[PDB]
Write a protein that binds this ligand. Sequence first.
Ligand code: CD4
Ligand code: CD4
Ligand code: BCL
Ligand code: V7N
Ligand code: V7N
Ligand code: V7N
Ligand code: V7N
Ligand code: V7N
Ligand code: V7N
Ligand code: V7N
Ligand code: LMT
Ligand code: LMT
Lengths: 273, 60, 60, 60, 60, 60, 60, 39, 39, 39, 39, 39, 39, 39, 39, 39, 40, 39, 62, 49, 49, 49, 49
Amino acid sequence: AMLSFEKKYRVRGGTLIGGDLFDFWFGPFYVGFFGVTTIFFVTLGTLLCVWGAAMGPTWNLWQINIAPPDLKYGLGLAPLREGGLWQIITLCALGAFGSWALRQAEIARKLGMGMHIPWAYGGAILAYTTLVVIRPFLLGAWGHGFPYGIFSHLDWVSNVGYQYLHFHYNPAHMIAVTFFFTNCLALAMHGSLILSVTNPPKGTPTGTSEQENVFFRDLLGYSIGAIGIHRLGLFLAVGAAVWSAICIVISGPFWTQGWPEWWNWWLNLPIWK
Amino acid sequence: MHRIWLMYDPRRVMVALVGFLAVLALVIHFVLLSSQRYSWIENGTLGADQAPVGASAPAA
Amino acid sequence: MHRIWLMYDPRRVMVALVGFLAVLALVIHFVLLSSQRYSWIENGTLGADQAPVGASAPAA
Amino acid sequence: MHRIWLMYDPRRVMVALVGFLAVLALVIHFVLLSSQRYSWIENGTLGADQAPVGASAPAA
Amino acid sequence: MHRIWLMYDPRRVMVALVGFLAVLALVIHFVLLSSQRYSWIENGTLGADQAPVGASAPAA
Amino acid sequence: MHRIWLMYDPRRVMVALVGFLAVLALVIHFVLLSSQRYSWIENGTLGADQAPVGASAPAA
Amino acid sequence: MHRIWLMYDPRRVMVALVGFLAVLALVIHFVLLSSQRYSWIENGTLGADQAPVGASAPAA
Amino acid sequence: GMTEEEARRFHGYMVTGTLGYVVVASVAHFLAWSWRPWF
Amino acid sequence: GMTEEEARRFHGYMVTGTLGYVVVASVAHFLAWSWRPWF
Amino acid sequence: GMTEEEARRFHGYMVTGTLGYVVVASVAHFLAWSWRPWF
Amino acid sequence: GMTEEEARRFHGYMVTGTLGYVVVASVAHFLAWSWRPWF
Amino acid sequence: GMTEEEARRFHGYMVTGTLGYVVVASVAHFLAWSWRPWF
Amino acid sequence: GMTEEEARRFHGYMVTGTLGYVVVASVAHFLAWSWRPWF
Amino acid sequence: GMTEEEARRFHGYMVTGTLGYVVVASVAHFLAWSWRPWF
Amino acid sequence: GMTEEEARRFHGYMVTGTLGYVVVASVAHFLAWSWRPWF
Amino acid sequence: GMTEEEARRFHGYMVTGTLGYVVVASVAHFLAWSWRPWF
Amino acid sequence: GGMTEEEARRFHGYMVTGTLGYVVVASVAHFLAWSWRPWF
Amino acid sequence: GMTEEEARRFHGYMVTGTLGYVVVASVAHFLAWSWRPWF
Amino acid sequence: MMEYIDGAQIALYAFWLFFFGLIIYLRREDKREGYPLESPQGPRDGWPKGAPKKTYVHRDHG
Amino acid sequence: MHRIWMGTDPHIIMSALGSFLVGAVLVMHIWAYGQFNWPATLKAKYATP
Amino acid sequence: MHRIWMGTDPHIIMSALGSFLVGAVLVMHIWAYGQFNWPATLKAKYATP
Amino acid sequence: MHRIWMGTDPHIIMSALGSFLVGAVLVMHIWAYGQFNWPATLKAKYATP
Amino acid sequence: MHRIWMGTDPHIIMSALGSFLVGAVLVMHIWAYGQFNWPATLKAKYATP
Ligand SMILES: CCCCCCCCCCCCCC(=O)OC[C@H](COP(=O)(O)OCC(O)COP(=O)(O)OC[C@@H](COC(=O)CCCCCCCCCCCCC)OC(=O)CCCCCCCCCCCCC)OC(=O)CCCCCCCCCCCCC
Ligand SMILES: CCCCCCCCCCCCCC(=O)OC[C@H](COP(=O)(O)OCC(O)COP(=O)(O)OC[C@@H](COC(=O)CCCCCCCCCCCCC)OC(=O)CCCCCCCCCCCCC)OC(=O)CCCCCCCCCCCCC
Ligand code: BCL
Ligand SMILES: COC(C)(C)C/C=C/C(C)=C/C=C/C(C=O)=C/C=C/C(C)=C/C=C/C=C(C)/C=C/C=C(\C)CC/C=C(C)/C=C/C=C(\C)C(=O)O
Ligand SMILES: COC(C)(C)C/C=C/C(C)=C/C=C/C(C=O)=C/C=C/C(C)=C/C=C/C=C(C)/C=C/C=C(\C)CC/C=C(C)/C=C/C=C(\C)C(=O)O
Ligand SMILES: COC(C)(C)C/C=C/C(C)=C/C=C/C(C=O)=C/C=C/C(C)=C/C=C/C=C(C)/C=C/C=C(\C)CC/C=C(C)/C=C/C=C(\C)C(=O)O
Ligand SMILES: COC(C)(C)C/C=C/C(C)=C/C=C/C(C=O)=C/C=C/C(C)=C/C=C/C=C(C)/C=C/C=C(\C)CC/C=C(C)/C=C/C=C(\C)C(=O)O
Ligand SMILES: COC(C)(C)C/C=C/C(C)=C/C=C/C(C=O)=C/C=C/C(C)=C/C=C/C=C(C)/C=C/C=C(\C)CC/C=C(C)/C=C/C=C(\C)C(=O)O
Ligand SMILES: COC(C)(C)C/C=C/C(C)=C/C=C/C(C=O)=C/C=C/C(C)=C/C=C/C=C(C)/C=C/C=C(\C)CC/C=C(C)/C=C/C=C(\C)C(=O)O
Ligand SMILES: COC(C)(C)C/C=C/C(C)=C/C=C/C(C=O)=C/C=C/C(C)=C/C=C/C=C(C)/C=C/C=C(\C)CC/C=C(C)/C=C/C=C(\C)C(=O)O
Ligand SMILES: CCCCCCCCCCCCO[C@@H]1O[C@H](CO)[C@@H](O[C@H]2O[C@H](CO)[C@@H](O)[C@H](O)[C@H]2O)[C@H](O)[C@H]1O
Ligand SMILES: CCCCCCCCCCCCO[C@@H]1O[C@H](CO)[C@@H](O[C@H]2O[C@H](CO)[C@@H](O)[C@H](O)[C@H]2O)[C@H](O)[C@H]1O
């Protein structure tokens, strides 16, 4: 099925790889070559996750836990029942996420859109790749990755934080948190403003960009304007993921002590040492 | 009975059916393979008298 | 009662009914398979006298 | 009484009602199944005087 | 009194009323179900002389 | 005094009044239900001389 | 004195006053209810000679 | 909205439903009271 | 939207179906009570 | 908006409803006081 | 939409499918019951 | 906005409302003082 | 969409294929049962 | 609602029914008193 | 709804049905009383 | 609301019903006083 | 919609007949049950 | 609101009702004094 | 005296019922444009059925 | 006295009155069973030891 | 005295009075049951020892 | 008296009446089976020592 | 009396009545088997020690 205006947009062309070969739709979905590789990796990864659940102690969704190998295996593939399965699933994940971003690029090219969406998603892929590839590689063992399990990965997050005694004191983490919180505030204001001009109280005329601009300017003192708020929301949301990648990659590979004692440089500035 | 295919496009039903049957079969095989009694890759050569059985209620 | 098919498109109702029954059946089977008494893949071969029973109120 | 069906569309009310009864029934069954006294899948075969009962007022 | 239906659309009021009553009933039931005195699923059969009572003594 | 209603839309006043009274009624009931003396669900059957009381100024 | 209502719209001032009085009253009740001497929901029935009094100068 | 006629006849059912509801609730409370008094 | 005669025809099905459902549920409580009374 | 004579009619209902509510609440406090006096 | 003769015709199959389904479920429950009763 | 005579009419009710409120508060304070003095 | 003649032709393949699949599955359960019965 | 003619006729049945109900109840209380006096 | 002609005719069967029901129950109670007298 | 003419009929019955209520209440108290004097 | 007066007339006669037969057979069954295992 | 003519009638009844209430309360106090003197 | 049922669990299912209600509402709002869908078998609505297309009152002059 | 029914719907009255009487009767029986020790004496007459 | 009724609806009058009478009578009876020890003496008369 | 039926659909009347009877009769039988100790005495006759 | 069937379809009537009888008869049999100790006495005849 198609939207009432959709058919004239369903042209050939805009692919990166494969040409006409996969240039077709399946229901709502665009396929393409990277659609085919997406489904391959998604399917292989998901079934290996189900296999991980089957050989683990429970089918309880919250408790399934496919763990990485012991650190002793270093950068090798471990035995599959001893964490090698987590490694194969990680390759499927990297393939699925990369295929998704390239399929987004093919869709955007077909619609004559800018490449903003694929690159914005690249921010999230960077954080995932930091957690399971880059940081474990810098530490010299794949066993530093997080386990695949809805709550067991939260146990990993807890323990990694307390490896540095007081992870709130990590300076890149403070920035990352500030971006996440500021993003959520900005999203609530942008949503509210557009809705409040487009859905005014009954019997009021539809609002305008001028009213939105005036109100916003009483909130922050300055006008952000229409393109400015979308630049800001993109800067905040993607910057949050980039600073997250920074805050975790410096924890271990570069800083090994507790995070509170990193702040010793501030106490010893020569003006007040 | 055949008028069901006037109501539904058979070309769509066969997609839905194959999808459903594929997932269902994978579910049932993985459920059995996770069991103790039917973990046939490790224990399939055991005779039915030798295969695991879950715990009884104790009598008292 | 056939005019329920004039209130509602039967093509839509049947997809919703098939969806509902599939989810319900899987829920009930997974509830039973999680139980002790009806963990039938492990203990299905036990007699009805041998199957687990949940504990009673203790006598005074 | 029937003029309610002019204020509300019976197509919407009937689907709202089905959804409400579905949710309510599932809530009551799962609340009972989680109790001790009415966990019928484990303990349904117990007689009424054998079934669990919550503790009395304390006595001293 | 009926001017209330001229100030407010009865269609809007009826939804708010049923919403209020449904929430209020569910709140009161689960508050009682969470109590010791009125946890009727486990202890409904006890009879009023041996149903729990909250602690008396202001002193002594 | 009635000219106060020329300033305020009565259609708004009633909503604000009901909102205020509902929140106030709920607050006071939960304040009491949090207390020792007026936890009526658990201890409502105690007589007035057996209900809890707060600590007096010391003299012992 | 009435000309203050020419400078300030009474439909604003009345609402501001009612809000101010509501929050002030709520604060003072909350301060008293939190105190030892005036926690009237628990200790209201104590006589004035029995109600708590805060300390003293330790003047030997 | 609706006429004063419509509003006034709607009010008759609304009052009658309310009365019916209070009646069932009152019996429910007296059953609950005789089962397990709260005062 | 319905004419009043359509609303009246619907109403009688809706009432009958409700009362039918309540009758079946009444038997279900009769059975459940016979197996394990909650009071 | 609202006219002078509507505002008057509304006021009479509003006053009656307010004082009626306070009378019911007064009886509720009389019952509460008889059950467990707070002073 | 449907014509009422089509609605009449479809209902007959729907009832028969519902009956056939309930029958198979009834045998399934009686097999389950005789294997391992739940009351 | 109000006229001066419209304001001067409102002022009469405002003063009476304020006096009534202060009177009720005074009786409340005197009850409270007789129950448990704060000085 | 399809002609009713085309619906009849497809129904023939569809019923036959469905039953053939169920026949193969019934033999698979015969073999599985013979190897390790679940009741 | 009812005209006076409907009301006048309705009232005769309403009064008769109320009388009949009280007559039956008076027998019931006579029998009840004979069985277990309550004063 | 029903005309008076229907209502008058419906009433006759409704009374007849009720009296049949009360008569059957009267025999039921007479048998029950002879079997296990409850006073 | 009501004319004075409607009000004058209604007042006649209202007084009569109030008086009758007091008379029955007076008998009820005389019986109660005979049974358990409260002063 | 539904039975006319004369369809209802035909239906009722069979409905009465079926009910009577069912009650008759159940009466026989209860006499056999009573003589087999009396319940009062 | 109430005219000067209406106010004159209303006053006479308000005075009558107040005096009646005071008379009944005078009997109540005389009875109370004879039962339990308070000075 | 219910051991398994506790207030945090009760609250969580209260939220789930609201949240699944909210997703339905949002998916109705999402269909005010582009629906009903075109299909070789005629129009399709998806589920839930969409809310109707809004018409917007423009500022009368300025 | 009949003029009070004027303007009402006779079905509304019979619904209200019917509702009240079912409620009142049910309450009076639930109360009466507590006070009169019946059917408790009936149950004790036929209870098995 | 009858002119007090003129602005009213007689069904509101009987509704309000009826609600007051129901309320007052119930309060009076439940109070009176507390003070007079009836039906408690009735219950004690037929109670099983 | 028959004039009370005029506004009504007789199928609604028969549905409401029949449903009331099914409810009332089921309650009365549960209640009676408890008070009269039957079928409990019946079950005690035909039981295996 | 036949007029009660007017405006009803014979098939909905027989569907509902047949559904009722199936339900009622199964309830009565399962109940009766519990009271009369049959088929339990039949089983005990042919059971193996
Ligand atoms: C539990 C945690 C609580 C924790 C406590 C949390 C409390 C939080 C409260 C937040 C309430 C927000 C409500 C709101 O914003 O409304 C918009 C309006 C601004 O809009 P506006 O357009 O400029 O308003 C003026 C006017 O044009 C509005 O007209 P409108 O037609 O829209 O109607 C709105 C009015 C309706 O009118 C009235 O209610 C006044 C009627 C006066 C009648 C007087 C009696 C005379 C007749 C006699 C018979 C009369 C018969 C009745 O309603 C409103 O919307 C506001 C209602 C009052 C809000 C009270 C807020 C306090 C609530 C406390 C709740 C405590 C808990 C129960 O502004 C306000 O109402 C201001 C609210 C009051 C703020 C006061 C400042 C606080 C200072 C605190 C200092 C404390 C230390 C000293
Ligand atoms: C954690 C907190 C935050 C968590 C935050 C999570 C937010 C999730 C929001 C998005 C969820 C909805 C996605 C969606 O609408 O997809 C379109 C599809 C179809 O409707 P349509 O698009 O309007 O119409 C097209 C269709 O009618 C005809 O299209 P065509 O002929 O071309 O293609 C064939 C059909 C076949 O239909 C399907 O395959 C539908 C299968 C949908 C399964 C997934 C449901 C997930 C529900 C999640 C909510 C919740 C469920 C409990 O159409 C299609 O092929 C459409 C493919 C759509 C693929 C969507 C995949 C979304 C997966 C999301 C998984 C999320 C996991 C969290 O919609 C549906 O099938 C129905 C969805 C109804 C909304 C969910 C409301 C659930 C409320 C609770 C249950 C209500 C029971 C009555
Ligand atoms: C248009 C048809 C009417 C109707 C007309 C009748 C008639 C006529 C009779 C009953 C009777 C009864 N009805 Mg009714 N009844 C209706 C709807 C209901 C509903 C409901 C949820 O809507 C319920 C719970 C009942 C309940 C009852 C029982 C108390 C009783 C017998 C069992 C029965 O009906 O089983 C559930 C079955 C159904 C709901 C199907 C419809 C009724 C069936 C077809 C009645 C067949 C038996 C009847 C005795 C045959 C008449 C000829 C006899 C020789 C006298 N009816 C519909 C709306 N009902 C009988 C009675 O009063 O016994 C004391 C009776 O004579
Ligand atoms: C933990 O303990 C805590 C919780 C803290 C303790 C404290 C609790 C508190 C404070 C509780 C407060 C409760 C409260 C306060 O007021 C509760 C108020 C309850 C109320 C008012 C209930 C009202 C119910 C009314 C009903 C059901 C009406 C039904 C009407 C029907 C069916 C008819 C509809 C119309 C029809 C059919 C005709 C259409 C005709 C049309 C269209 C036409 O004719 O045109
Ligand atoms: C915690 O609690 C827990 C543990 C979970 C426990 C509690 C569980 C609960 C609450 C369960 C509730 C269950 C329930 C409640 O209602 C269940 C209700 C179930 C229902 C209604 C099932 C109905 C099934 C009907 C079927 C299968 C019909 C099939 C029809 C077919 C095949 C024919 C189709 C038509 C054709 C072929 C003709 C085309 C002609 C055409 C087009 C023409 O002619 O044009
Ligand atoms: C930490 O310290 C802690 C512990 C907290 C201790 C310290 C506490 C402190 C510092 C407290 C300070 C308190 C204070 C300071 O000022 C308190 C000041 C209080 C005041 C001013 C109260 C005033 C109340 C006035 C009222 C209620 C008026 C009502 C008016 C009414 C009803 C009439 C409305 C108009 C009508 C009807 C006419 C319409 C006609 C119209 C429209 C027409 O005619 O047109
Ligand atoms: C234990 O402790 C506590 C609880 C405290 C103890 C205290 C308890 C107390 C205080 C009890 C008080 C009870 C009470 C009063 O006060 C009780 C009052 C009861 C009453 C009023 C009963 C009245 C019954 C009337 C009936 C059955 C009428 C039936 C009429 C029929 C069948 C005719 C139908 C046809 C009509 C009408 C019109 C046809 C014509 C038409 C349509 C036309 O012609 O158009
Ligand atoms: C704990 O101890 C504490 C509690 C502290 C102790 C203290 C308790 C106190 C202080 C109690 C005070 C109680 C009290 C007073 O103060 C109680 C007052 C009671 C009163 C007033 C009762 C009045 C009853 C009146 C009745 C029944 C009227 C019936 C009228 C009927 C039927 C006719 C209706 C109208 C018709 C027919 C005309 C139709 C229209 C027509 C013709 C037309 O329109 O034309
Ligand atoms: C254990 O404890 C508890 C559970 C408490 C104990 C139990 C207690 C109770 C209270 C039980 C109650 C049971 C009961 C009632 O009260 C039971 C009532 C049973 C009834 C009503 C049975 C009726 C059966 C009727 C039958 C079989 C009719 C068949 C008719 C046929 C075949 C003809 C079909 C139509 C034709 C041929 C015409 C077509 C013409 C057409 C179309 C044309 O001409 O156009
Ligand atoms: C314990 O310690 C502390 C508490 C400290 C101790 C101290 C306590 C103190 C200080 C108490 C003071 C009490 C007091 C005063 O001082 C109390 C004052 C009481 C008074 C005044 C009572 C008055 C009652 C009046 C009544 C009942 C009137 C009824 C009127 C009726 C029926 C007629 C209605 C109108 C009509 C017919 C006209 C319509 C015509 C119209 C419209 C027309 O004609 O147009
Ligand atoms: C255990 C199950 C108990 C019964 C379950 C409830 C369903 C009973 C259905 C069979 C009994 C007859 O039920 C009755 O059917 C008729 C039509 O046939 C419905 O009648 C409906 O359609 C007819 C026209 O056909 C209209 O005139 C009528 O106003 C309308 O209500 C009734 O509303 C319903 O009361
Ligand atoms: C809507 C229809 C169905 C509603 C079903 C919901 C329950 C309604 C119950 C109302 C009647 C209660 O009836 C009451 O049942 C109890 C069940 O313990 C009987 O109790 C007695 O008999 C039962 C029989 O098994 C014994 O187990 C029990 O020890 C004994 O006390 C009471 O003597 C009877 O008074």
